[PDB]
Design an enzyme around this catalytic site. Structure first.
Site, short mmCIF file in Angstrom:
data_model
loop_
_atom_site.label_atom_id
_atom_site.label_comp_id
_atom_site.label_asym_id
_atom_site.label_seq_id
_atom_site.Cartn_x
_atom_site.Cartn_y
_atom_site.Cartn_z
N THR G 1 0.83 -1.24 0.00
CA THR G 1 0.00 0.00 0.00
C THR G 1 0.84 1.25 0.00
OG1 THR G 1 -1.81 1.03 1.30
CG2 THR G 1 -0.23 -0.42 2.61
N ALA G 49 8.05 2.08 -7.62
CA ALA G 49 9.39 1.76 -7.43
C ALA G 49 10.21 2.15 -8.63
CB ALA G 49 9.68 0.25 -6.98
#
EC number: 3.4.25.1
Lengths: 196, 233, 238, 249, 246, 205, 201, 220, 234
Positions: G1, G49
């Site tokens: 999350t 990411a």
């Protein structure tokens, strides 16, 4: 890895198992509204714990295998066969980009003998036994699991035994957890037991 | 004995000659290209309406702006279209434009003939395709319809019909269709010819309709819309 | 007989009959004139359609933006040779970073054509290509046949009714060489119209032109600029 | 190769069963009788050894019966050259399955795997099928005790008592009456087995060299595969002749 | 390994030789019927020639490719088509079935598996040294919305969705007759779907209620293969009901 | 017969000799890392049913490669009606480990067995992928090789019966488990007659 | 999350949220970064990411959804598309891959939302985030979290979360990208400018 | 004409002879193998005669039994050789229609299969219709047997049903074979009775010879 | 190679139940020169007669008895060309087994391994089925072994068998004189009798060769010794 818990205590025919709900990627629990205890067949369960992500990967690989063997037999799986095959397949897959480095738990109902529980490590060493624990939790649980039955379990004492352990895992061991699924599988139907 | 890979005394290949006649056993493909979309009509080729029309496929989307209707040897066609879907999509993926009808057509035409019982392996052919395709779609330039046949000839088409009688399907076209005409007449002009080329009836379970139009992807006609078009003959 | 039952079996003619069958496939194919100057190489091709309610489509297929081909024979077979040719141009660009030498380029095709001719009963590719290429030597117009043998021609016309086109190349044999690029395309349409009877004459719809050269990439004109070239008739009196 | 030497060795027939396979059945017929009978505590194979002559070193246990694995065995009826390729591979697959899985090899599993190789030869390759029909005897923890047959094509059928070799048709007919699907103990099963060899073989006095019975029985919690001794086979034959005289008059 | 010269070649007859031999080889065969229920989707074959000396195990025409997908093959012919041929089409689809099943989170789309099946029998026709199988298959399963399907392929790979389709004994003959049999009120419970499969099979079966083999499959639970003794009980009920009708 | 690492929760083999019987004593230990959960699972295996070969380290490839070797031993055992020689099997194992090339994963084989149909005593250990190891003396092997080696010299009774070797061995195993993590985890002692195998399972954690 | 890819589903419709900004530290080169990739209306995806790994797996996924849709004709299962992509991701490691994607698309039971990792996670939850910054985002969203939130509360919830995020962890810039999947076919709401969101919250 | 192919044994031979009586056409029977013979050049001459005589007779049917024979075998036992086979095969085509275009001469061709038949001979448009018999079922079989039972000695020991049931979906010929072998069998006993015992023994031999069920039972 | 090649089998079955080419091959082994192989049960002796018929063969090397390795030997029957590949093949196999076991290949095992390659050669195209019959001898594991390998692929283990010219007569003499588990002297004597049964290949010492396998390995015998055994038979 080095998170995520399993414990199983096998009874007269019952087996009670619990694992925590919590799939944490990075720092936060990404999924939690799914369980990661899988029905690979309706007589066989694999509950995988270690890497939160790695559990699904192993489950799927076994899922095709378990079925290919089922074909071969053309009748339901054999417990002895399931521990060795899953062990071989998983030690070879550990090196693979599609890895395994999970402590898995086989529950199966055997066509002849009866209830069978099969131990698997992260290193991946096959053993049938009747007092075993999984995950990071396996180091913590196994001596205790050695002590509290005589041969195998009795459900009443087990229930007390289980609630006592579940406060400990949150206490000493560190998970993100807020709910646990407790289950007994008699070998043909899934039963829900209560969470502590 | 000698091959089908040998030349005839005519100075033409034996195997290619046979392939065109093979087409004539099966289904039809009618594609009419208008400047308001490209329509494809094809026969499901039924034995009864008690054959579910839930997921009989013979007009299939190659891309989501190009559709393809097939004619000829229906079996051989199923693998040619499945294959065609990956190659068009490799092109869609790299260029990130909306594919042109002429690029899909050229690409599939070299696969038609690689035949031979020497200089070929299992992934290569040992027989020529006898599938003639009609690729119909809308691109940047606008609506185009291309015809592909086993000899690899690609041509620009405003109306092309091939079927159970290839010759038959075409002769009716001249008679009905005219160059500049509406979409709604274009769909109808296909239902009148469709019968002529079939030896079989007009049933809603026996025809399949799909339109690819500006700003609008490949669409598959349902039972109600299949009926609207059957009404239009 | 029994000496064309395969292409492995040799004829007491000195040339297998099967090699010669393949030569008829190319004749049956499209009239094509190929001429060169000393900067540019031009491919003039005749389109054909397989239906009445169809608009005719190019018989010039791209190898690339520096070497290009015109088909005479099967469209499929020309394309099959083409794909290999396309690859070579893709490698030429990697290794040399120039347009691949045309003579070199033709010998590698010839090697491929050679192979089914060696195999048991397998088909020699029944296309003839007129290949227009521009390298550091100059323009080249080559004739490739259903055998492995290539000819370097000044101007050659192959396909159907091509002798009438061939007498034109002979008459203006020196002229192509000195001329400007627009004129090079103009003699090609005059020659190409000669194949056809006095009645049948070239129009913008059925005319495909492939121009390659020093100054420019391979461009296909199907109605792009076919018209100013098309201008002026001069047909062979049949 | 050449296409005039080709009329297609491998092809489909419109009758659905390959020419070379029917031709291979006649060859199976020629070789001696190999049978399998089920017991309610074992399974056994009874076969007549290819050799019948005085001269035989007896390096193999029996030329027909191959001990493949510690829960599987097979016998061959047909071409002996063809037998050697299938039996060596068989030896390796059956063995890998008991050894690793700790779960005794099913005949049904085994056959499907081998039949794939046999079949490849009949459909494509320009080749030809194997000359043998092999009878598998084993025990698996799934179905229980089993008997399987495989044919040149790679067609299988699972019986529980079947005979192949010469007078096959007669034999299976005799077998239907006396055995259905399980009623005979290990000793009656063995008596039944000697009985089938008796009618079908010309010599009705038999010998321990002439026939070989190998039994597979799970005794004392481990599955035991054994070739019976010349004495043990001879005792079964001596017991069977007395009973032969009385049975048929 | 494969044959250097091709078994299947385009020759003049309109198709191909091996397709042509292959249509003959499922025509001359026995009946395999598949009816599409609303409970279970059930397949059955006319012949196995059971007589109580043998037992079926993998001997079945009906083999489950997947947890909710199964196919019943009629290789079966003048003198009997090959279980050997069927098994290859079975092996290749089953691995693919399980890979799709893994990928979709609800019961595997039949559609993919049948399209796939069609291409497997066609790729052999284009492949050097090979020829197509002489089977016709009834590909059955449930979709990812739980939609029951009964699909059919012929030998060269062509596919259709069907309510009910019957093959072999003249394919056209038997399938037109299965439309008549078929009721939508006769598929509402599990025994009634099974009764429609069996009625088409009885027509010319030699020693019926033993040769008759039909298997049932559930929504994502594995195939349940029925023994012929258990099937016989239903066969008696309909065979009397059928007599009553004439 | 290369096994991944050595970590199998126990690695120990001792073989000790008599003239009336020969004995191979083994950890019956299973389960990798320090944590075990089990103490049962095959490790010493009968291959002619009267000779043993012991493969030692982690469970998976130990069981896997043994069985795949068993099939080649078997081929040779099958065809002839007399079973293979110990000396020829001794180089066979040496080669099997060698097939796994340079910078290989370490197993430690122990073969104990009387020779078939030429009757003399045999004990041998392999380790690494190494030179031939025929001895007629005594052999102890594992990663704690020195600890096993001590014990293998310790039991030889040249004149007592088979029984006295067993009772001596029970103490020998126990003292070794208090010295290393390689012995123990249950102990299986095999006294091998030539005609059969006797398996005895010892009391000892 | 976690990170700049977040999706949660509610009772009016569904919200999708992404940034369009790149460059931790002074370093920057991409200012109209399309973290929510969607060249078509049928499937939607998100990044998270590592920059390279998301983009690579999702362009491979881009091809993959289109292929399923073409083959079935009608659109397939959201699960099958996503899972075919997951098999590739686990195998994909050894390129310094560390892909953390959230797959969104329409399945037959309803909307399907699944969580993808480079180590092959697949679990269906009502809410998923990939990265490290949504670790910050879960405190203000969770506190106010209802799953029957108004369309209007959700737009205001996303707008404010970026503005507050900018303050808390810097990184936002240029544009705030908002997308809503309403029913089963998606639409991009607005590519609203950063400077506006700062004032509102 | 018609071309009679499919499973052999359906009763292909009975059918030509039976239809021939109803039409009342002169029935000429000549084997296809008889036309190739030792003699050199006699072979096509004979085929001319066969057609010429059929024509003169007026309504006619020529039943050509076992025509399959010319194609299947390249005999290698005739001094006429491969030459003989060639020249014969053409002449029948010539005499049939050809440029001759003889009328009133129907040819009914009995063959095993017309996939084993010679491709010169076979061709559509000399024979307009081709009939493929299905495999005979249990049902068709009863009617043929009731007739044979009527021709045979009458008893209650004749058990028709049992024999028909046991057998598979297989030829008309078998029904004839069971009845002929049953009478023969009786003579061996020294009995002029044909009882259920002769029939049960007959069922085994007929079934093996014709196709045999125990191979087929595995594949099914 | 640089061609397409073959892969179609040259053998098709028969409705007889036979494979056609192996039966033609069986005729070629009979057309050979007499080769006998007997396992005594006190050693294995393989004896052959070799038709040179000119003794212009300076062989101190290759013969019809050639050692495969140091305790396996091989003797053939029929034609020489087919032998040449099989003898090389056997040496290669001997080498494969030498590496792992380091005791050269055992006889029971050898045959299975040759048998599998022989079967392919029939089964496949671009190769053909032999028409040589090999007699394989070995002494390993303290037991003598004698096998016969047929040109199809089949292997049978024999006590005494014959091949080559007039094998039918040979096998019948072998049953009468030789009985199972007789002495090394009997095995040798009958072995040389079968060659003498019908000779006709020039009667000089270098026209017969014997090679003997026993407890100490395998060596082929000098032609002069072979002649002494013959001399007894009239």
């Amino acid at each position: 890895m080095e998170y995520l818990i399993g414990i199983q205590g096998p009874d007269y025919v019952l087996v009670a198992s619990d694992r925590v709900a919590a799939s944490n990627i990075v720092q936060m629990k990404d999924d939690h509204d799914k369980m990661f205890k899988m029905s690979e067949k309706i007589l066989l369960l694999c509950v995988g714990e270690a890497g939160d992500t790695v559990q699904f990967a192993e489950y799927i690989q076994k899922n095709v295998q378990l079925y290919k063997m089922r074909n071969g037999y053309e009748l339901s799986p054999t417990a002895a066969a399931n521990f060795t095959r899953r062990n071989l397949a998983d030690c070879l897959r550990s090196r693979t980009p599609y890895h395994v480095n999970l402590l898995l738990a086989g529950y199966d109902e055997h066509e002849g003998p009866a209830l069978y529980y099969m131990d698997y490590l992260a290193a991946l060493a096959k053993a049938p036994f009747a007092a075993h624990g999984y995950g990071a939790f396996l180091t913590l649980s196994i001596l205790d699991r050695y002590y509290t039955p005589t041969i195998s379990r009795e459900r009443a004492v087990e229930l007390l035994r289980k609630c006592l352990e579940e406060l400990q895992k949150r206490f000493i061991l560190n998970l993100p957890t807020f709910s646990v699924r407790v289950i007994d599988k008699d070998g043909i139907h899934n039963l829900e037991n209560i969470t502590f | 004995d000698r091959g089908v890979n040998t030349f005839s005394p005519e100075g033409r290949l034996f195997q290619v000659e046979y392939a065109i006649e093979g087409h004539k056993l099966g289904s039809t493909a009618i594609g009419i290209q208008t400047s308001e979309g490209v329509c494809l009509a094809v026969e499901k080729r039924i034995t009864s309406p008690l054959m579910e029309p839930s997921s009989i496929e013979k007009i299939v989307e190659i891309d989501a702006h190009i559709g393809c209707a097939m004619s000829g040897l229906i079996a051989d066609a199923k693998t040619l279209i499945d294959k065609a879907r990956v190659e068009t999509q490799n092109h869609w993926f790299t260029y990130n434009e909306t594919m042109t009808v002429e690029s899909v057509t050229q690409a599939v035409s070299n696969l038609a003939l690689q035949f031979g019982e020497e200089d070929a392996d299992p992934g290569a052919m040992s027989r020529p395709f006898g599938v003639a395709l009609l690729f119909g779609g809308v691109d940047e330039k606008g609506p185009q319809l291309f015809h592909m046949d086993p000899s690899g000839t690609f041509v620009q088409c405003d109306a092309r019909a091939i079927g159970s009688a290839s010759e038959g399907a075409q002769s009716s076209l001249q008679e009905v269709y005219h160059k500049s005409t509406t979409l709604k007449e274009a769909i109808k002009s296909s239902l009148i010819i469709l019968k002529q080329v079939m030896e079989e009836k007009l049933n809603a379970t026996n025809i399949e309709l799909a339109t690819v139009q500006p700003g609008q992807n490949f669409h598959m006609f349902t039972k109600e819309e299949l009926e609207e078009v059957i009404k239009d003959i | 007989n029994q000496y064309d039952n395969d292409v492995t079996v040799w004829s007491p003619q000195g040339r297998i009959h099967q090699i010669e069958y393949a030569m008829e496939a190319v004749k049956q194919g499209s009239a094509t004139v190929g001429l060169k100057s000393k900067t540019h190489a031009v491919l003039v091709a005749l389109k054909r359609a397989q239906s009445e309610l169809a608009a005719h489509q190019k018989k010039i297929l791209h190898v690339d933006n520096h070497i290009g081909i015109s088909i005479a024979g099967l469209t499929a077979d020309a394309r099959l040779l083409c794909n290999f040719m396309r690859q070579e141009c893709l490698d030429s660009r990697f290794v040399f970073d120039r347009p691949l030498p045309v003579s070199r380029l033709v010998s590698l095709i010839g090697s491929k054509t050679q192979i089914p001719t060696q195999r048991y009963g397998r088909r020699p590719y029944g296309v003839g290509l007129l290949i227009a290429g521009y390298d550091d030597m100059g323009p080249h117009v080559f004739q490739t046949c259903p055998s492995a043998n290539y000819f370097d021609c000044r101007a050659m016309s192959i396909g159907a009714r091509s002798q009438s086109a061939r007498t034109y190349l002979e008459r203006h044999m020196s002229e192509f060489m000195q001329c400007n690029l627009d004129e090079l395309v103009k003699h090609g349409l005059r020659a190409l119209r000669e194949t056809l009877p006095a009645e049948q004459d070239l129009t913008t719809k059925n005319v495909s032109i492939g121009i390659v050269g020093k100054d420019l990439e391979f461009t296909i004109y199907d109605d792009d600029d076919v018209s100013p070239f098309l201008d002026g008739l001069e047909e062979r009196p049949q | 190769m050449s296409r005039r030497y080709d009329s297609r060795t491998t092809i489909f027939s419109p009758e659905g069963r390959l020419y070379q396979v029917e031709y291979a059945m006649e060859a199976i017929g020629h070789a001696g009788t190999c049978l399998g009978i089920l017991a309610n505590d074992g399974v056994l194979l009874a076969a007549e050894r290819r050799n019948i002559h005085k001269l035989l070193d007896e390096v193999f246990f029996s030329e027909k019966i191959y001990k493949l694995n510690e829960d599987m065995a097979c016998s061959v009826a047909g071409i002996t050259s063809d037998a050697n390729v299938l039996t060596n591979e068989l030896r390796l697959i059956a063995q890998r399955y008991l050894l690793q899985y700790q779960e005794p090899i099913p005949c049904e599993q085994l056959v499907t795997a081998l039949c794939d190789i046999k079949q490849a030869y009949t459909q494509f390759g320009g080749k030809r099928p194997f000359g043998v029909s092999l009878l598998y005897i084993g025990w698996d923890k799934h179905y229980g005790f089993q008997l399987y047959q495989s044919d040149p094509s790679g067609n299988y059928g699972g019986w529980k008592a079947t005979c192949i070799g010469n007078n096959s048709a007669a034999a299976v007919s005799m077998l239907k009456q006396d055995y259905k699907e399980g009623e005979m103990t290990l000793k009656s099963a063995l008596a039944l087995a000697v009985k089938v060899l008796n009618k079908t073989m010309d010599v009705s006095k038999l010998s321990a060299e002439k026939v070989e019975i190998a039994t597979l029985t799970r005794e004392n919690g481990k599955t035991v595969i054994r070739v019976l001794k010349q004495k043990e086979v001879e005792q079964l034959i001596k017991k069977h002749e007395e009973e032969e005289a009385k049975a048929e008059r | 390994m494969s044959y250097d010269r091709a078994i299947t070649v385009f020759s003049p007859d309109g198709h191909l030789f091996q397709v042509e031999y292959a249509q003959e080889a499922v025509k001359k065969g026995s009946t395999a019927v598949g009816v599409r229920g609303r409970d279970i989707v059930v397949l059955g074959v006319e012949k196995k020639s059971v007589a109580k000396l043998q037992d079926e195990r993998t001997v079945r025409k009906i083999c489950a490719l997947d947890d909710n997908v199964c196919m019943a093959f009629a290789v079966v012919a003048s003198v009997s088509g090959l279980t050997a041929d069927a098994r290859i089409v079975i092996n290749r689809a089953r691995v693919e079935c399980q890979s799709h099943r893994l990928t979709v989170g609800d019961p595997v789309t039949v559609e993919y598996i049948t399209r796939y099946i069609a291409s497997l029998k066609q790729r052999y026709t284009q492949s050097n040294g090979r020829r197509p199988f002489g089977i016709s298959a009834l590909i059955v399963g449930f979709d990812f919305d739980g939609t029951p399907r009964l699909y059919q392929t012929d030998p060269s790979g062509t596919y259709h969705a069907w309510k009910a389709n019957a093959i072999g004994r003249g394919a056209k003959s038997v399938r037109e007759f299965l439309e008549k049999n078929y009721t939508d009120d006769a598929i509402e419970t599990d025994d009634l779907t099974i009764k429609l499969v069996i009625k088409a099979l009885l027509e010319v079966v030699q020693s019926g209620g033993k040769n008759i083999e039909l298997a049932v499959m559930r929504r994502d639970q594995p195939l349940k293969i029925l023994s012929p003794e258990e099937i016989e009980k239903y066969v008696a009920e309909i065979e009397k009901e059928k007599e009553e009708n004439e | 017969m290369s096994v991944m690492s050595y970590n199998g929760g126990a690695v120990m083999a001792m073989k000790g000799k008599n003239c009336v019987a020969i004995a191979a004593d083994r950890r019956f230990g299973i389960q990798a890392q320090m944590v075990t959960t089990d103490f049962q699972k095959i490790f010493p295996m009968g291959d002619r049913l009267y000779i043993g070969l012991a493969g030692l380290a982690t469970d998976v490839q130990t069981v896997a490669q043994r069985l795949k070797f068993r099939l080649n031993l078997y081929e040779l055992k099958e065809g002839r009606q007399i079973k293979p020689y110990t000396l020829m099997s001794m180089v066979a194992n040496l080669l099997y480990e060698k097939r796994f090339g340079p910078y290989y994963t370490e197993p430690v084989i122990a073969g104990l067995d009387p020779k078939t149909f030429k009757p003399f005593i045999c004990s041998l250990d392999l380790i690494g992928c190494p030179m031939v190891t025929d001895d007629f003396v005594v052999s102890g092997t594992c990663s704690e090789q020195m600890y096993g080696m001590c014990e293998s010299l310790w039991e030889p009774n040249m004149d007592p019966e088979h029984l006295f070797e067993t009772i001596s061995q029970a103490m020998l195993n126990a003292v070794d488990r208090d010295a290393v993590s390689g012995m123990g985890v249950i102990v299986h002692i095999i006294e091998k007659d030539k005609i059969t195998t006797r398996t005895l399972k010892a009391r000892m954690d | 999350t976690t990170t700049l890819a977040f999706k949660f589903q509610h009772g009016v419709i569904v919200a999708a949220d992404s940034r369009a900004t790149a460059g931790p530290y002074i370093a920057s080169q991409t200012v109209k970064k399309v973290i929510e990739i969607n060249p078509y209306l049928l499937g939607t995806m998100a990044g998270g990411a590592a920059d390279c790994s998301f983009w690579e797996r999702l362009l491979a996924r881009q091809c993959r959804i289109y292929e399923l849709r073409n083959k079935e004709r009608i659109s397939v299962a959201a699960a099958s598309k996503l899972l075919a992509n997951m098999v590739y991701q686990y195998k994909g490691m050894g390129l310094s891959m560390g892909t953390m994607i959230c797959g969104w698309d329409k399945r037959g039971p309803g909307l399907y939302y699944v969580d993808s990792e480079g180590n092959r996670i697949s679990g269906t939850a009502f809410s998923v985030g990939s990265g490290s910054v949504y670790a910050f985002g879960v405190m203000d969203r969770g506190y106010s979290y209802d799953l029957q939130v108004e369309e209007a509360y959700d737009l205001a919830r996303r707008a404010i979360y970026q503005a507050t995020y900018r303050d808390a962890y810097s990184g936002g810039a240029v544009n705030l990208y908002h997308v809503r999947e309403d029913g089963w076919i998606r639409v991009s709401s607005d590519n609203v400018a950063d400077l506006h969101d700062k004032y509102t919250s | 004409g018609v071309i009679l192919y499919g499973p052999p044994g359906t009763g292909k031979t009975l059918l030509a002879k039976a239809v021939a009586n109803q039409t009342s056409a002169t029935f000429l029977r000549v084997v296809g193998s008889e036309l190739i013979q030792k003699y050199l050049g006699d072979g096509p001459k004979l085929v001319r005669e066969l057609f010429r005589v059929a024509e003169e007779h007026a309504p006619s049917i020529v039943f050509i039994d076992e025509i399959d024979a010319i194609g299947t075998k390249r005999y290698d036992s005739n001094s006429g050789g491969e030459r003989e086979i060639q020249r014969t095969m053409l002449e029948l085509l010539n005499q049939l229609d050809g440029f001759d275009s003889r009328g009133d001469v129907k040819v009914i061709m009995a063959t095993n299969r017309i996939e084993t038949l010679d491709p010169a001979l076979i061709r559509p448009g000399r024979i307009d219709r081709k009939i493929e018999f299905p495999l005979p079922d249990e049902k068709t079989k009863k009617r043929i047997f009731q007739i044979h039972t009527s021709r045979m000695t009458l008893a209650d020991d004749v058990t028709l049903d049992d024999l028909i049931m046991a057998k598979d979906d297989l030829s008309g010929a078998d029904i004839k074979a069971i009845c002929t072998e049953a009478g023969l069998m009786a003579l061996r006993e020294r009995r002029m009775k044909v009882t259920n015992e002769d029939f049960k023994k007959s069922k085994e031999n007929v079934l093996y010879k014709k196709q045999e069920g125990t191979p087929e039972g595995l594949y099914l | 190679m640089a061609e397409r090649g073959y892969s179609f089998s040259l053998t098709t079955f028969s409705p007889s139940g036979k494979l056609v080419q192996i039966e033609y091959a069986l005729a070629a082994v009979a057309g050979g020169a007499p080769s006998v192989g007997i396992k005594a049960a006190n050693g294995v002796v393989l004896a052959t007669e070799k038709k040179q018929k000119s003794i212009l063969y300076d062989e101190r090397s290759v013969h019809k008895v050639e050692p495969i390795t140091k305790h396996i030997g091989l003797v053939y029957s029929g034609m020489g060309p087919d032998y040449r590949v099989l003898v090389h093949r056997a040496r290669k196999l001997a080498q494969q087994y030498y590496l792992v076991y380091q005791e050269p290949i055992p006889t029971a095992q050898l045959v299975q391994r040759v048998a599998s390659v022989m079967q392919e050669y029939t089964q496949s195209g671009g190769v053909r089925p032999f028409g040589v019959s090999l007699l394989i001898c070995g002494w390993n594991e303290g037991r003598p072994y004698l096998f016969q390998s047929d040109p199809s692929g089949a292997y049978f283990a024999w006590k005494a068998t014959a091949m080559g010219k007039n094998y039918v007569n040979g096998k019948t003499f072998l049953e009468k004189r030789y009985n199972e588990d007789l002495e090394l002297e009997d095995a040798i004597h009958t072995a040389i009798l079968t060659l003498k049964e019908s000779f006709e290949g020039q009667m000089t010492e270098d026209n017969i060769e014997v090679g003997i396998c026993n407890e100490a390995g395998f060596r082929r015998l000098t032609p002069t010794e072979v002649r002494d055994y013959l001399a007894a038979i009239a």
